[model samples]
Target chain A: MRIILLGAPGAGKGTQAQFIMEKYGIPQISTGDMLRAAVKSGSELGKQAKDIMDAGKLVTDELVIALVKERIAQEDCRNGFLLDGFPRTIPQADAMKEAGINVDYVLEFDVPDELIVDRIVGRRVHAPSGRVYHVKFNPPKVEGKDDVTGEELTTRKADQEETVRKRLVEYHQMTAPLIGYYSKEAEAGNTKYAKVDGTKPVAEVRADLEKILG
Target chain B: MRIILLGAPGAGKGTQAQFIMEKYGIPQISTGDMLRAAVKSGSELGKQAKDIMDAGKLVTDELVIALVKERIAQEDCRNGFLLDGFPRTIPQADAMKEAGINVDYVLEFDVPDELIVDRIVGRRVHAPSGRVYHVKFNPPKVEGKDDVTGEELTTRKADQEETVRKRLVEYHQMTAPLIGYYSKEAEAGNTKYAKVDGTKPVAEVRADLEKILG
Candidate 1:
């Protein structure tokens, strides 16, 4: 099925994608991962992106969507695809529809504001390995320390409780309605829409997804 | 059958690709063309590549190869595929073989250097539209002018006698051995190899290719 996973930052969309990819054997088409791979490869497109970045300018959404269109048109995407972190705006959503890309499912992860704040506030990252730890749910052996390296772990500035809270408020204010729009579209038989409680354990969330997708 | 077409520049590989694609009912895999389309779409890959390009650095050959790898793994390539203007070096060929990319045939267009020079010298392009014109073989209705716009046409600098001579020298120095290498590999059951006279008319070349690939 052509699927889309939607959630605010820290709502565990990435973790859910990992599970979906393993269970379904479909590629999790994350725009962030795709962009990073392209940049790392240093292809001609990477060269163009690097120039824009070096100039301290944002790569426009139009450019980003264009690449997505070309990429999905390749022979690899014939069976199905799962999109992550695309259509961040209504305009982008419209663009996808205009381009004749139809999504079978749009899955939104709904987590409470307090839960997201707690998750991000307790999170610690191992930079070299990208292993994530949480103070509340999955803390390391030692406080404020990385279990692998025995080094102090640092939380992202953006992950600060205040910052996380502000972002959540803004996200709900702006992005919540997009969920409603998808629900309406789903009712019209254009796509399928479902919401899972992201506050539950990751496995539970996966179970809900399988019920929706399977 | 997975197929690759190998030839020096101006050997009409693109022209032949069109014919082969039509005959086989398959797509031609020109990584360069695909990359350009991706960059135009402004997808995530395009953004990343565009960033690198904007930084004023060259994209690595490895990246281009990776893009090719990703592309061929698509479903459209499952029934059959054609590669052109790739595997330019021995290392690239080795890499494909190592990666288990089993090409069925490698068709080499064998045009004489004198013929290549003759073709290049008389070539003219419509400046605005970039449509190519050949003086002796495929001239426009109005002499020295574009058919659509009636604008005067000119030969590209690289199509000049001296430049064509230099390119022919480089082709012989660098690419000639590739033909022999593929021939040996074919003898070893790696892939079937055929050398066709590119000096022939386009239709004749197409007919010869049809017999082998059909």
Candidate 2:
């Protein structure tokens, strides 16, 4: 049940991932959360990371992979797990191979760039709670207010139209090749990579995944 | 907290990780298990991985990154995670940086190569059930037999004396640079990467980690 769900930002990976996780009882592993947690924990890595940050240095990829490798080995993963976004380069993929953790599936969610812009730009968040809202697709009843908390939500820094567009460019430059890489791996039949239309309803996507899992 | 526990083959990573996980309620992710799970899940990457294995071609680092990146994005990772035994190469580390999930720490278990060889070569496994045994360190009740199944336990194919020596050589070639890389990252305050002697008793090592983690 180990799976990697691939999709551009705003392709509803989070929404669909929740469904799959609940249905299958598998945990999801994300690198961002892992890094933050490490930093907060004050473990050896966290201490070093703090030192690096105090020195104003960007954290390196090698350390990230090291953390990722350790994070996935827990007891909970015995049933299965899901990967959201990671491995922005070929070298990271190589590291996984060298480490010998065979991935079973790479599920790519295909959606248009314009659609992504619509989904991302219209979004706002209650950062502390991670409550989300969209000005268009799923807006809150009161503008700029969290539906439940009644607290004001703010637009994400990356959600700015220009920032999102820039991110898209960067994403394409970095991730497009990765998609090609996975496509080739899928063709080989050992990794089982596939792409699904993300524009479809969330339920349909889950159904597709269920079929694939079967 | 997100953390990366690094150690050679017999450095008690599993023991330490289990303690830390229970203490903090975090999940430990192993690159080895993740890959195997992916192969079982039937994702596109799994198909390709299967093909590569079937064809006797090593899974490339690039393909592995694709799989890992996708794996990291799942929901459970939103809270925290740990990585075990990944980023074995500089290139892989470099790719992790490009992806922006920089590591917070690189925790190295500094065990002598001779000790690693001694520990690993002594190991045996109940292959059908994947239960492990050790001839000296954790020997079975009955010689050459599984405790539960009574099946014959076999030595690992790569556990021969010669193979162990070769593996040590390979580790020095591939893993030595990683120590420096992680240490440098820690110095720069990007993440905390530290080393601890692994030859100490498991309890002592755990105590050291407790101090470091605190």
Candidate 3:
């Protein structure tokens, strides 16, 4: 199914994405990666994109829209795709809608605000590698260091209690509309919206996804 | 006057931007900063942007377009702005044009590829502090160290000759159209276009800029 995953910041959508992709054989489509691939393809649009890109220009929505439309039409995406990171705004969604691109599911990973904030506050990351670690749960082998790389771990500002609390408040206000947007799409039929408790164990959540998808 | 700086990667447009902003009393408008400011605004567009943002969504061109329009209409921008690090794409420039936004100048910093490549290769930076230094021209007090923090200097991959050589080709290819785009704008009669031999001494370039803008 064409799926979009929505979750709280600490809700582990990425891990779930892997499970879904592996189990369902749907490829993950990253917009940045897609753009790079498009640039490499050297198609007519790709040539235009390269011109702008070499100029160090901002890749506009018009180009992105064309790129995405072209990408979804690719053979690999013929089976299905879980577009990982695109359509972040209403205009993006509207663009997809205008192009007649539709999603089968908008799956939200529901987690409590308190849980997400508490969970996020402990995150230590290897910034270069983008490897995430939680102080309590999935920790590093040594204090303030990566397990394999042995690089110093840094905490992103967003993982702090103060920032996370503010984010939760702001997140709800911002996310409410998106949920409503998908709900309306669901109401139009052919689309499904489902929610799973994101705070549950990974195995349990994995099982819940299988139960939900079928 | 509103201005756009056109130059190759290592052509030192940033240096000129600093000079112009200080001398002309015009603020530099960064699109990224503008988006963040709009998010803090609680305006209709800002609120929508906040929603997209808190959810870790990619900021689409529509949001950027709106943010740029809104930012230019603000009090500080009433006099003018040095449109920095934006309109990198033709569509972005076209969006501004369609919105009835016009520029007084599109200043090109023309520098030879070989000189830029040689200069960039000798550069060092303190990543966190962003203190830029050159090995021969502006070497730090201690070799391979930041003078202020006494930290080891890091070289960016882009500063390597092979990478920089490739960049020059791609940059020229990409940037070629933007020059032509603005030339057309200049042909329309309101906007003026000028070029400075960026190879000139810094003082000469600044003097050239002043005269061109005047």
Candidate 4:
């Protein structure tokens, strides 16, 4: 059950990814994690990866897809694996197809853009401890206090409406196209495409993903 | 003449870009600056830009190229503009070509991998005052002290060898292809592709760029 999770930032993909990973007993493959691991191994590819990264540039699709291919071929991935943040662009998706890396499903966690904005903007965290809370979804005990330490909960500058809104636009332009791309691939019988509502309760979202996986 | 500056992270493209902008009396246009400007304007595009950016994804080449198109059309750009960081990928270069945007030169500041690593890893900054000093090229008066203020100078974590090596790898993988892409364009006489050695002194590099611009 090789799978790719797709969603905009603040759309609960991370939360749902864990559920899918646990239920399927598959590791979640993230490119950043893999790149770091590769670098640590100090192999030829790792050396190549290190040089590119040190120059403050994005790793090429060729290298990234190659890393993904190698990871999927590993023993643990024989049962299955979830691709958390791979195939980000249309080119990457096309490359995956070209490389004959067949995905079983592309799960898109759908959340309304406005709701995403609301969710992120209302988020507050204890600056020192990094305990996160939401004003609407999971409020702290005292309006702006950390439950454990009683420290002031502050909103991340990244969570400000303006910042989140900008990210949404970038997500739509770069990753949203993958939703349509996968839909067409599914139509062509290459993979299954499912859209799960991300705004639902965590348990409900997990249930929805489980149903799709089953 | 409208131009695009291309280089690795520590290739001194920024420094050369400033010289070009000064000599040509053209503004240096960076996508980040444009995106921020668009978001701040709160117009239709601004609203759309805000939404995408807030989601923490890259603004698509289409959007970025559109912004570049709009930017170059402004009054100040009549004398031409220096593109500080644009057309990063082959797709972006192709899109600019498709959009009928003619670039006079694509200046690639070339520096060897080891030299760039050495250059960046040796950089120290006065954190509060934002004064930069390089250990090899422009050392501070006192080994780790600011010349003017006698403040303590610190090497940025970003300048650490590990971080710099990672960035170099990423630059090679992501942006190196543009070198070939633009070289082909130059061969076809569509645009002039020039490589200036960034390892040279700042003034020498500026002279090379000035000669090319002339």
Candidate 5:
């Protein structure tokens, strides 16, 4: 089942996406991951992408589109894969559409903006292992220690309240039209679109996805 | 149902597309036609498209993609639409796929390179009404004259041997990958791909398409 995940920052998309990937045995195709993979492959397109990166320029949508197609054409994607952090804007979505990469689902995680701020600002990370924690919901045994390493936890610059609110505003502006766009696609019988309440506890949200995707 | 017409330029794709439109009651979604219609409608996207055009810039693929989707959503495309003159590259095709614009067919018209050169160079046009003629296949009753108005015939620069051969080179370079791309799509059971011999006479070519589409 090809899927596109949509949500605001700190909306628990990563949590549920992990669940969906493990359960369905499908890989996640994140733009960053694919870009790195393409550059590593050392193909002509990879070299081209690398040069653009070396120049510290933004990779064009056309180049990203090529990378995604290359990634999808891999053996592991024979079953299908999930698209994460892509089609971030309508044009990105349109470009993907032009590529003929139809998905089975456009799953949107719906969480309130204020809640997004709270969830984000309260977060801490065990940087090396990428273990996550929150001050209130999933706190560590000690106030600021990592479970595995027992070291001081770190906070990401992106998780700061200032950055998150800015991200939320941009997300809302970009996603409102995308929601409308996919809703019409659903109405036209092109693909299935579902919105799950991301405000729920992580397990409950996964339960919701289990049923919705069922 | 959706369809994409694939052929080297001047291999009579336009002719087959018209036949399909009339026979199946679908509109052909050519980029130029859709762009003009969008500008005339004066919708927000139209205005956006117009401003870009007024600036003497090539409309980005993202913009063309938006225009195509809008055109396809119109009443005439309720049944289906034929995609023509868009998705000219692998990225463009990839974009369509990403948008969930799954097509029913990827119909390729195969004509020899020499034949394509010949077929294009031998063409003549009556500019006012756009009546087409050929030196051998469909000559005018009076040489160098239009059938209705007896207006003097004109030859487009595009139909010159020099230009046609150059275009043929570019077409093969671009289209080689696209053919492989769609051929794999067909293998994946996403669409049907057929190659009709475009060197056939007009009626015979249409007959081949009629059977293939049937």
Candidate 6:
């Protein structure tokens, strides 16, 4: 089951991806992870990628798609793999299509942007132990304090409202198109497209995903 | 002339945008700026936008397109407007087309990702006086110090390598499509499309832009 998951940041995509991965026993292929691994491997592509990255440049789509192609050709991906962050743009998607990658389904986690912001921005963490709490959804026993250690909770800069707003803007500008792209593909009988309500409970979202995958 | 500027984050779109706006004597219409104005005005759409924004949600594109339509109809935009950050997605572009908004030209500042990354990451700033310098291209008199005050210079978080890489990734994923979209428009003779060498000196880039606009 070759699959792609799409959603804004803090849209519970990470949780749902984990669920899908465990249920199907398929590896979740994240492009960022793949690039880091490739860079560390010090192969030809790795060296090339490293030089570009050390200069703080983006690794070209050609290099990224090539690495993905090589990865999916590995023995473990025979049963299929879940693509987490690949095919982010139309060009990348087109490259995958040209490379004969046949996706069975594309799942989009649909949640209102406001909910995402609230969920992310209100989140606080006990940095030492990595324990997390949401101010609204799941607050700690005392305000701004961790339950167990009585340590102060810190909010991640990324989870701040302004940062979250910026991220959502980027998502809307870039990733949102994939929704229309996959929908068109589905209409043309290329693959199945499913929109899972990401705002739902974890189990419910997982159930919906499972039903669609099945 | 109505214009849309397209480029990667560090591709000098902002610089070129300012030049075009100045030359044309038209306001640069950024969606972010418009949205903020709308939210502040307390108009019907403004209220709706504020509600969504306060909830941490993205104001729908329909609303944004409506706001743009209203904005351009105002007296200031009668001559023309330079769209700096609007129509980020193909849908937004299509929406503008449907709404009878016509663009005369779409200027793309083309720079290699490597150059952009280098330019951005090398940037250093003296925050107090807001003076900027580049390490290789425009270094300060003394290392890690401001030219005037001799105070320590700081690198903006946005100019950090990791942040820049992320921005470039977002650009490739979302904004790159505008190139293809406008290119097709130019081919169809619907609008003029020009790609400027953003890696060139600032004056050269401005000169090229002036030639195209003229």
| The best candidate in terms of TM-score | 5
Ranking by lDDT: 4, 6, 5, 1, 3, 2
Of candidates 5 and 3, the better by DockQ:
5
lDDT of 1 by residue, B20-115 (tens): 777777878875455444554445555455444433233455876788888888888889888987766666677888887777899999777777
The digit string of per-residue lDDT tens for model 2 on B66-120 reads 6567667888676777777566567767887777876656789988887887688
**How far off is model 4, as Cα RMSD?**
19.0
Among incorrect, acceptable, medium and high, the docking class of model 3 is incorrect
Candidate 5: residue A50 Cα off by (Å): 15
Q: Local distance difference test, per candidate? A: 0.71, 0.69, 0.70, 0.74, 0.73, 0.73
Model 2 agreement with the true structure over A1-214: per-residue lDDT tens digits: 7787777768877667767777889986866456546766778878767644333233555666666667676778776788766565554665555444457888888999989788887878776655666787667899889888899898755566666676677668666677888888778665898788888765688888788877
Positional deviation of B132 in candidate 3, in angstroms?
Answer: 3.5
**Can you tell me which runs of candidate 1 are displaced by over 4 Å?**
A35-60, A125-132, A140-157, B1-214
lDDT of 6 at B122: 76
Error of 3 at B157 (Å): 3.8
Overall local distance difference test of candidate 5: 0.73
After aligning candidate 1 to the native by TM-score, how far in Å is the CA of A107 from where it should be? 1.2
TM-score of chain B of each: 0.72, 0.76, 0.71, 0.73, 0.76, 0.70
TM-score of 3: 0.42
RMSD of each: 18.5, 16.2, 19.5, 19.0, 19.8, 21.0
Supply candidate 3's per-residue lDDT for B58: 35
Best by DockQ: 1
TM-score of chain B of 1: 0.72
Better of 1 and 2 by lDDT: 1
lDDT of 1 by residue, A1-214 (tens): 6888888767878778877777877777776556545666888767667644433233567756766777776767777778877765554565454334568899998877667778877878775555677787877899888888998887655667666776676667655667877888799788988888888876688888888878
